[PDB]
C-alpha cells in the first residue's frame, strides 16, 4: 500500500501522525511508537495532530507516555485539533508547540453517558467530576493560565485561531513559511 509506505517512511524519519478520533487501538499504536523511538535518548520526537478528539483514558495514556521519556516531543497542529486533540497538542514540551496559520483549535468539556441504579449513577458522577477537575488542573498547569480562568473558559466549547491560541498560551509560536 502506498499509504502504508509513506507512513512507514515518515515514521522512519522522526515523525508520528494522529489523524483520526482517539480510541484504544490508535492510542496503543502511538504509545508503542513513542516507546520504540525512545530507544534513542537524544533525538526528539515530532507529533502531528489532526483529530476531533476521543476517549479520555486513551488520551491520558498517550499523555503519560509523552511525559515519561526524556525525549522532547514537538507538537504541530494542522487542520483541526479538538477535545483530546488540543490537550495532546498542548501537552508538548514548553517552547516546542506550533500550529499552521489556518489551524483551528477547540477547547471542549468532557462528555459521557450514564445508566444504572442510583448508587452506580452517583459513583460514576463523582468519577466524571474528578476527571474534569483533573483535566482542568492539567490544562492550567500546561498553559500557564490560572485555574479558575481555565475552568470558566471551559464551561462551553471555545474556538481559537492560531494567533488567538498563541496569545492564550495554548501554542508557543505559529509558523508562517518554511
Amino acid at each position: 500500500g502506498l499509504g502504508d509506505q509513506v507512513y512507514n517512511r515518515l515514521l522512519n524519519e522522526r515523525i508520528i501522525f494522529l489523524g483520526q478520533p482517539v480510541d484504544d487501538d490508535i492510542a496503543n499504536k502511538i504509545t508503542a511508537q513513542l516507546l520504540l523511538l525512545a530507544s534513542d535518548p537524544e533525538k526528539d520526537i515530532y507529533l502531528y495532530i489532526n483529530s476531533p478528539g476521543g476517549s479520555i483514558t486513551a488520551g491520558m495514556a498517550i499523555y503519560d507516555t509523552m511525559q515519561y521519556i526524556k525525549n522532547d516531543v514537538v507538537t504541530i497542529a494542522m487542520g483541526l485539533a479538538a477535545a483530546m486533540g488540543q490537550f495532546l497538542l498542548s501537552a508538548g514540551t514548553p517552547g516546542k508547540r506550533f500550529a499552521l496559520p489556518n489551524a483551528e483549535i477547540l477547547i471542549h468539556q468532557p462528555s459521557a453517558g450514564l445508566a444504572g441504579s442510583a448508587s452506580d449513577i452517583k459513583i460514576h458522577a463523582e468519577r466524571l467530576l474528578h476527571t474534569k477537575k483533573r483535566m482542568a488542573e492539567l490544562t492550567s498547569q500546561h498553559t500557564g493560565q490560572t485555574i479558575e480562568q481555565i475552568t470558566r473558559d471551559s464551561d462551553r466549547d471555545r474556538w481559537f485561531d492560531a494567533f488567538e491560541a498563541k496569545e492564550y498560551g495554548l501554542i508557543d509560536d505559529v509558523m508562517t513559511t518554511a
Binding site: 524519519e13 515530532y46 516546542k96 518554511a178
Partner: peptide, 6 residues
Amino acid sequence: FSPAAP
C-alpha cells in the same frame, strides 16, 4: 516542516 520540525 523544516525549519524547524524537522
